[PDB]
Design a protein around this ligand. Structure first.
Ligand code: ATP
Ligand code: ATP
Lengths: 341, 89, 284, 396, 165, 277, 170
């Protein structure tokens, strides 16, 4: 299954909560929302506000909001007002390009990582009607690359160019009350450093917590992939890739993972918690001038089917206008070397 | 316009390897490269980028054959681990 | 072309127009054409002092001091005669045609106004063709500067005549290409064994003229011409001197031509790589 | 500084050679090359330009100087080879050359030209000026001027596409040029067809040259058409002539009449509707439109000096009628002014002289025989030190 | 072994070129390639080299968004040196329309390929690798023919002149 | 309600808005402006737009460049200087760059077409020599453009040379400053009390600040000048030094916008003006 | 102006032009011997190469009708071998009718004012008869030489030249 849109590279993709509409920017000032009409795609919305390029978008699946981050140091919140989407001025108190963004599952705060070695956190205040930015400065020294939320709406992953995946604590104390304790540690104020990774090799392109959020995993530029645990006390496990450079990766259960890269065909993963083994699966796929349906690399992986746990449908959007939609149960049949736990 | 202040801001063994490989003949590359583990290949990967950087009389010819068997075993991601190691040997 | 023009196409178009004006009886016109040629040779054709029927050829050089001591005036005063007059102010030789005394067949003197620089290099050769054919050796060798850095060295021997150009390859790239032309010039007798044989060396003057002030330098090669009496006999003076007095300029030609052959070959090839680079560029 | 400098002036149909100091070129050769049907050595020298190129039936006659731009370099390059060693006989290391080029050429195409002179000819100087500036430099010797000025109007009358240029302080203005596809060649076609229909016995396969010479030897601008037809009907003597064509095939002489294609020949410049319905716009105001696009300050100098160029303005009193044709134009537009409105009427002068046959080249002998040209050439070391960007632009 | 020399290069350029968009860590709102300005140290990859002999060597310098590949060319003698130097200086004048190269090579090297992120976008980046191989494929032979061109055409030029005496 | 009548660009609008709700220039000659207007200090307004009290203004627009130190309520007039480099003289320099690249342009007729190129292609460089290792060395700066008469030119090395040569007193024929110099002169002409207050209170305002990287050059040159004349060579005492230079996103339509927050409007405004009191 | 005055009135697409005819008597009459159809031959060759003639007047509707009339007559005198043979072929075309305003088969109907009644069309046919009459006997001395049976070649050279690219009959 493969639709293609355009020649331009698209930045990132996101969905509504039913996972029907999709919204992407193909290398321009304009992010376009698309939508199935049967097997026919419909350019339902166009957004023309950013005077620079835009780089990372997330659709808010429940509040019907849209967060932006780009290169003209400006991030805008787009909420549905009837048919015409309307922006929202959000000042991060940073000066350069942002890199990625995603909503916390409370839909009360969003994390922006950028080039000024700081992470701006805007949570919405109500009296001023404002998204007050608050910063996590120490000890980030490089440009923040990928982000991920714990489902508790408290912790926050962080990945930058100093190779060190420093998972954090960003409990905002005035819009959130005192959360439950966490297998990382006890006291969780804002800006609280919790654990710096043991990776001095390869950039940190993609990080993700599990559905528990106790497990967290990351893939690295030097063709490696590494995972750690909150329950097994920060124990970073090591696995090297014997394939091509890679960008995106996601869980499917709590110890079963799927990642694709510059080949744009996947190769599953499962965390053997018993033997303590990150063991790389086997493409789980089955085979211009290219065997993979999409031309360029991946840029993002995300799950169509009901959260990261179930977990069946997932699509691959990259640096070209194609989307290859992949179902797990569609891939369960013809593969003879897959591993699922 | 005349000074560099881009750095001053408040932010942010060798001859042993060449001697053995050139004395190792070309016919025993498959028995030499494949005998190492997952970390021995990347240890051998930085070795091949020593004599190719610093050539001698009989250096650069046979080591292309040494690059050949380690290409298939090392794959394609094994080369990056030369590139991305900010502290290397 | 492949052989150069011993003809002089800047006059052979010009005066061939001029006599047909009088042959049709038209009034002649105010003509003053000032122009040049190889080797620093300057010309000047004009109506001398204001009559349109009088047509004066006039040539300037710098060699007439060095050349007149080698039997110049016996040649051209014999050949051109009453055509030749007093030299014009600032000119070595000055011929004169008056259009009221046209000859019978004009295609001779039109053709024989085109040898006008050729007749000056011949006389030093005709002097030294006598000394070979009569055995009168013991002669000083003619040192003739034909540019600022281009000297001519002749030599009369017993059964042969040799002669030497002092060439200067003024750039740096021409030298490397220019040395390849003397290779096949040294290999000239692979099938032409009746050819006048040529020696060559670079930067090192011949030892026969080592007694001179012959310079040594990166720009300079030394080219010989073994001239038997079989090519300098009385039958073929005039053939031999036509070829030989332009050979320095002839070799300036095919160096620049073989450069020109590269830029047509290579410009095709830069369209070939630019083709393939547009193919990985998508059709969309 | 003692031996003079070549001015190779590659026009559209006719190349203009010549050395400095000269009133007229030593060649007027048709800009054409015969080449054999890649080729090597003796196969890759058989190059014949100009008169032999029209002559030779064996090899095809490419015209790479088309619309003023170069169609292809590797055949232009062979033409620049044998324009030196065969016809000029110049010393290739010892003359400060002056190539010339029509307006709106790309400054890549300068560094294609200037590359080959510094890398296949070793020239000691080079200065690739535009055709428009040295055109009007020729009319400085005219008695119609007394003072030097390098700001005005030229009227190129070419052979592929004629142009119109306003010029200012030695620089063309790339906003306001206009292609007009009338030419020297368009007058050839229809008057050849005008003698297809009246003269009988002319062989069709050489009739273009036959149509050429009667345009050459007998054309004239008619001042006004409506009196003009009667002057053939009233007077059959002093307007009817007879042309004596030579049969190139059958080796004979044939007489033909000199009739009506005289006066309509130059008159199609005054109305393009005679030969094309593509342009309903006469020349009497389309130059004034090009005038009316330039800024307000430069127009009042731009009326005083309109300069004729090219061979296609060698028709009797072509400047005289077109002067009145612009005076009808500009005074009618200020006839709008005094009604609605006070500004003084402005005189408009066109320029003519003897060498306007080839007044593009005659500017080349007003430059290369001056010491200032020796100040401004690209030397050979300047290409070697700094690179082709010095020769991609032009000096003053 | 002339073939597998290009193979390991083909086996390295593919690994070399997996890039992305990346803005300037130093300067607000810019996008300049990293392997040229070199102002952020930690981004630049380790420069590597591959060679067949003492001469035929190829340098690769990777970064996050641009890779400066340079090539040493076989220069057998001095007559091919001007054939080397012009053939470069021909195309280096023409790097504006033929526009993935550098104007001036690396000191010690002969031509320098500069592939940014944008050139990997608007072109099929699995074939720009193949173009770089293709450029090294035939300039071995391109110069090799023009030697046989010149050594033939002098023999045409010389034999005409000498028989005319 | 606020009125905003400018010198080189004239505004109008209502109170509590987002933008000047109409725009048109002023065609004695300002007295006729009232006719098409009623039919549908700046720096205090500029600071309170960002919402501050005392800071540094980079007022760089079209006709002339101001630099303004302004206190909480009042300005600092004798401290506030005015240069004479403009925005148009960048374009007048930019023609001569492209003219020496080889493209024919007149300074009169071809004016606005170059102005499109400046607002799209042109910017500033943090250093010169590392930047000029891109024109002479690499392809990258070469970007296409299309003229309105259909021609397609390429501009490479003449992009970044918008600011530089008339900072030198040769090309401007005026002994003067760079840009951070008169900036640095004015603070050291100002007090020592709010000195470090100033170096984190620099605002850029105007269309002649839209060059990307302009707050990356002003941060680099002040690390020269404070090292030069004040601190005189010391290493780690310069590492203490606070540098924050600000530039708003909506700053081009901000002068009328920022006044709306101050504008405590009334029931009446006619009762003071002397032709309608 | 030259071909229009308010003394004469607009009947039809054109105004009825003051003829001087083969006969004297009751007619649209003029003082001077020079006629519109004389002028339609006098300024003919200065008007034959245009594409779009102006409209200053409604007499151009007559004037280009004569032009397309002469466009027919040039097709006839290509084949003529005596003066009597020419006139009878002109008496042939002078009687044979072609459609005249707003009429199908007749080109350029969008220009001419069409008379709708039965009256004015016939009077126009009575006037266009006189156009076909009065022109041809004035073409006898002006196409042929004063030495008779010599067709002048200064009228031969218009045989391919038309007012525009239309066919008159088809
Ligand atoms: N006396 C004349 N009568 C008729 N036609 C002439 C006369 N003199 C020149 N011509 C015509 O003028 C034409 C030459 O035009 P022009 O001199 O502009 O050509 P060009 O120099 O090659 O073009 P350009 O200078 O525009 O590149 C010739 O084709 C010739 O037919
Ligand atoms: N996007 C842009 N990039 C570069 N320069 C720009 C841009 N937009 C505007 N400018 C420059 O800014 C100038 C106008 O800016 P601005 O509106 O601040 O001045 P202004 O208010 O018109 O001048 P005045 O204060 O005299 O009215 C123009 O001359 C233009 O060159």
């Amino acid at each position: 299954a493969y639709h293609s849109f355009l020649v331009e590279p698209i930045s990132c993709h996101a969905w509504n909560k039913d996972r029907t509409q999709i919204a992407i920017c193909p290398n321009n000032h304009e992010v376009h929302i698309y939508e199935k009409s049967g097997a026919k795609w419909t350019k339902v919305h166009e957004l023309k506000e950013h005077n620079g390029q835009v780089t990372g978008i997330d659709w808010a699946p429940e509040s019907n909001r849209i967060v932006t981050c780009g290169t003209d140091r400006n991030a805008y919140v787009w909420t549905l007002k009837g048919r015409t989407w309307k922006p929202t001025l959000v000042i991060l108190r940073i000066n350069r390009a942002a890199r990625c963004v995603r909503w916390a599952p409370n839909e009360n705060k969003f994390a922006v990582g950028s080039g000024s070695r700081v992470i701006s956190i805007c949570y919405f205040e109500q009296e001023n009607d404002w998204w007050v930015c608050k910063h996590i400065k120490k000890p980030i020294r490089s440009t923040v690359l990928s982000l991920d939320w714990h489902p508790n709406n408290v912790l926050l992953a962080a990945g930058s160019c100093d190779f060190k995946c420093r998972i954090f604590s960003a409990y905002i104390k005035e819009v959130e009350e005192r959360p439950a304790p966490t297998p990382w540690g006890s006291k969780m104020p804002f800006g609280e450093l919790m654990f710096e990774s043991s990776s001095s090799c390869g950039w940190v392109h993609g990080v993700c917590f599990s559905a528990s959020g106790s497990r967290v995993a990351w893939v690295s530029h030097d063709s490696t992939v590494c995972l750690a645990d909150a329950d097994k006390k920060m124990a970073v496990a090591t696995l090297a890739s014997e394939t091509l450079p890679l960008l995106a990766l996601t869980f499917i259960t709590d110890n079963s993972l799927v990642a694709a890269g510059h080949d744009c065909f996947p190769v599953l993963f499962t965390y053997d918690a018993a033997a303590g083994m990150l063991s790389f699966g086997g493409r789980l796929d089955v085979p211009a001038g290219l065997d993979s349906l999409h031309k360029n690399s991946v840029s993002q992986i995300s799950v169509l089917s009901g959260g990261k746990a179930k977990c069946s449908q997932f699509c691959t959007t990259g640096m070209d206008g194609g989307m290859s939609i992949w179902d797990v149960k569609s891939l369960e049949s013809a593969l003879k070397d897959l591993k699922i736990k | 316009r005349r000074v560099d202040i881009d750095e001053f801001d408040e932010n942010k063994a060798q001859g042993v390897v060449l001697k053995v490989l050139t004395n190792f003949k070309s016919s025993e590359i498959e028995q030499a490269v494949q005998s190492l583990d997952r970390n021995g290949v990347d240890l051998l990967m930085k070795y091949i980028y020593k004599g190719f950087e610093k050539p001698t009389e009989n250096s650069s010819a046979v080591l292309l054959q040494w690059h050949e068997k380690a290409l298939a075993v090392g794959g394609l991601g094994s080369i990056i681990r030369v590139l991305t190691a900010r502290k290397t040997v | 072309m492949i052989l150069l023009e011993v003809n002089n196409r800047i006059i052979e178009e010009t005066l061939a127009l001029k006599f047909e004006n009088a042959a049709a009886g038209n009034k002649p016109e105010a003509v003053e054409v000032t122009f040049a040629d190889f080797d620093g040779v300057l010309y000047h054709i004009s109506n001398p002092n204001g009559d349109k029927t009088k047509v004066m050829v006039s040539i300037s050089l710098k060699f007439y001091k060095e050349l007149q001591a080698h039997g110049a005036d016996e040649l051209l005063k014999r050949v051109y005669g009453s055509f030749l007059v007093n030299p014009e102010s600032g000119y070595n030789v000055s011929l004169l045609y008056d259009l009221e005394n046209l000859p019978a067949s004009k295609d001779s003197i039109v053709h024989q106004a085109g040898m006008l620089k050729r007749n000056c290099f011949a006389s030093v050769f005709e002097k030294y063709f006598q000394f070979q054919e009569e055995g009168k050796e013991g002669e000083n060798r003619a040192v003739i500067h034909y540019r600022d850095d281009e000297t001519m060295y002749v030599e009369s021997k017993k059964d042969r005549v040799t002669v030497v150009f002092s060439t200067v390859f003024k750039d740096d790239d021409d030298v490397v290409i220019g040395k390849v032309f003397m290779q096949e010039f040294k290999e000239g007798r692979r099938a032409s064994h009746t050819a006048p044989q040529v020696l060559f060396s670079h930067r090192e003057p011949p030892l026969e003229l080592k007694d001179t002030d012959a310079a040594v330098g990166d720009n300079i090669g030394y080219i010989t011409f073994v001239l038997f009496p079989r090519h300098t006999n009385a039958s073929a003076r005039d053939n031999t001197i036509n070829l030989i007095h332009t050979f320095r300029d002839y070799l300036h030609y095919h160096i620049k031509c073989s450069k020109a052959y590269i830029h047509t070959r290579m410009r095709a090839k830069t369209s070939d790589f630019l083709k393939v680079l547009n193919r990985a560029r998508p059709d969309a | 500084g003692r031996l003079p400098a070549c001015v190779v002036d590659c026009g559209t149909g006719y190349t203009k050679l010549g050395y400095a100091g000269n009133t007229e070129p030593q060649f007027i050769i048709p800009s054409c090359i015969a080449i054999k049907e890649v080729m090597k050595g003796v196969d890759d020298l058989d190059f014949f330009i100009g008169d032999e190129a029209i002559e030779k039936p064996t090899y095809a006659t490419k015209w790479p100087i088309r619309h003023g731009i170069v169609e292809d370099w590797d055949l232009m390059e062979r033409f620049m080879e044998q324009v030196i060693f065969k016809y000029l006989r110049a010393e290739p290391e010892d003359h400060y050359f002056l190539l010339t080029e029509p307006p709106l050429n790309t400054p890549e195409n300068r560094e294609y030209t200037a590359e080959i002179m510094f890398e296949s000819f070793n020239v000691p100087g080079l200065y690739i000026a535009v055709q428009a500036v040295l055109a009007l430099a020729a009319s400085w010797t005219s008695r119609q001027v007394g003072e030097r000025t390098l700001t005005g109007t030229v009227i190129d009358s070419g052979d592929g596409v004629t142009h119109v240029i306003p010029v200012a302080e030695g620089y063309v203005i790339g906003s306001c040029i206009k292609h007009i596809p009338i030419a020297g060649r368009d007058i050839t076609y229809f008057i050849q067809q005008l003698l297809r229909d009246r003269e009988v016995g002319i062989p069709p396969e050489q009739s273009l040259e036959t149509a050429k010479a009667v345009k050459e030897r007998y054309s004239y601008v008619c001042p006004d058409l409506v009196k003009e037809f009667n002057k053939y009907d009233t007077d059959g003597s002093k307007w009817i002539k007879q042309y004596t064509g030579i049969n190139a095939i059958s080796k004979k002489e044939f007489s033909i009449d000199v009739g009506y294609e005289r006066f309509l020949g130059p008159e199609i410049f005054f109305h393009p509707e005679f030969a094309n319905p593509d342009f309903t716009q006469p020349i009497s105001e389309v130059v004034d439109e090009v005038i009316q696009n330039c800024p307000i300050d430069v127009r009042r100098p731009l009326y005083k000096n309109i300069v004729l160029s090219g061979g296609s303005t060698m028709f009797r009193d072509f400047g005289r009628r077109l002067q009145r044709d612009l005076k009808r134009t500009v005074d009618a537009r200020l006839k709008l002014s005094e009604e609605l409105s006070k500004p003084k009427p402005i005189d408009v002068q066109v320029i003519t002289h003897h060498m306007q046959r080839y007044a593009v080249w005659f500017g080349g002998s007003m430059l290369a025989s001056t010491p200032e040209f020796y100040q401004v050439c690209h030397t050979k070391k300047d290409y070697e030190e700094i690179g082709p960007s010095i020769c991609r632009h032009n000096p003053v | 072994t002339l073939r597998p020399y290009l193979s390991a290069v083909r086996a390295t350029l593919q690994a070399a070129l997996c890039l992305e968009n990346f803005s300037s860590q130093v300067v607000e709102r810019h996008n300049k390639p990293e392997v040229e300005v070199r102002s952020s140290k930690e981004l630049l990859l380790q420069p590597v080299t591959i060679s067949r002999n003492e001469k035929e060597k190829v340098l690769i310098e990777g970064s996050i968004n641009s890779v400066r590949v340079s090539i040493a060319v076989k220069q057998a003698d001095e007559i091919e040196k001007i054939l080397c130097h012009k053939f470069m200086r021909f195309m280096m004048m023409r790097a504006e329309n033929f526009f993935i190269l550098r104007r001036k090579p690396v000191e010690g090297y002969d031509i320098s390929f500069l592939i940014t992120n944008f050139h990997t976008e608007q072109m099929y980046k699995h074939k720009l690798v193949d173009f770089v191989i293709h450029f090294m494929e035939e300039i071995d032979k391109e110069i090799s023919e023009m030697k046989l061109s010149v050594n033939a055409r002098a023999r045409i030029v010389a034999e005409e002149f000498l028989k005319n005496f | 309600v606020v009125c905003d009548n400018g010198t080189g660009f004239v505004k109008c609008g209502y109170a509590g808005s987002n933008f000047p709700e109409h725009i048109f220039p002023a065609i004695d000659d300002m007295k006729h402006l009232w006719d098409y207007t009623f039919g549908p200090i700046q720096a205090v307004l500029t600071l309170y737009a960002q919402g501050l009290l005392t800071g540094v203004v980079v007022d760089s627009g079209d006709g002339v460049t101001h630099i303004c130190p302004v206190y909480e309520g009042f300005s600092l007039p004798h401290l506030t200087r005015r240069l004479d480099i403009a925005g148009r003289d960048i374009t007048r320099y930019l023609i001569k760059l492209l003219l020496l690249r080889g493209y024919a342009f007149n300074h009169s007729a071809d004016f606005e077409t170059v102005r499109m190129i400046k607002e799209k292609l042109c910017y500033v460089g943090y250093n010169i020599e590392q930047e000029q290792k891109l024109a002479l060395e690499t392809t990258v700066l070469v970007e296409s453009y299309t003229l309105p008469d259909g021609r397609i030119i390429k501009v490479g090395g003449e992009r970044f040379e918008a600011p530089e040569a008339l900072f030198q007193p040769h090309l401007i024929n005026v002994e003067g400053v760079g840009v951070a110099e008169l900036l640095f002169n004015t603070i050291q002409a100002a007090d020592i009390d709010t000195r470090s207050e100033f170096y984190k209170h620099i605002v850029l305002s105007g269309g002649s600040t839209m060059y990307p990287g302009l707050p990356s050059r002003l941060e680099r040159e002040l690390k020269q000048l404070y090292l030069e004349r004040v601190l005189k060579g010391d290493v780690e005492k310069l590492s203490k030094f606070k540098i924050r230079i600000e530039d708003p996103p909506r700053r081009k339509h901000m002068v009328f916008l920022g006044g709306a927050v101050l504008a405590d409007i009334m029931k009446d405004k006619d009762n003071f003006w002397m032709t309608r009191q | 102006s030259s071909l229009m005055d308010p003394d004469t009135k607009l009947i039809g697409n054109m105004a009825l032009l003051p003829i001087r005819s083969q006969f004297k008597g009751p007619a649209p009459r003029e003082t001077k011997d020079t006629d519109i159809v004389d002028e339609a031959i006098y300024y003919f060759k200065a008007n034959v190469f245009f594409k779009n003639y102006e409209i200053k007047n409604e007499a151009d509707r007559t004037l280009i009708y004569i032009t397309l009339y002469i466009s027919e007559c040039l097709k006839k005198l290509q084949k003529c071998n005596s003066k009597s043979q020419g006139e009878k072929e002109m008496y042939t075309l002078g009687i044979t009718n072609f459609p005249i305003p707003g009429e199908p088969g007749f080109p350029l109907n969008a220009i001419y004012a069409k008379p709708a009644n039965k009256q004015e069309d016939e009077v126009m046919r009575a006037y266009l008869q006189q156009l076909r009459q009065e022109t041809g006997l004035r073409l006898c001395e002006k196409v042929f030489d004063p030495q008779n049976d010599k067709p002048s070649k200064w009228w031969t050279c218009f045989v391919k030249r038309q007012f525009m690219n239309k066919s008159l009959s088809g």
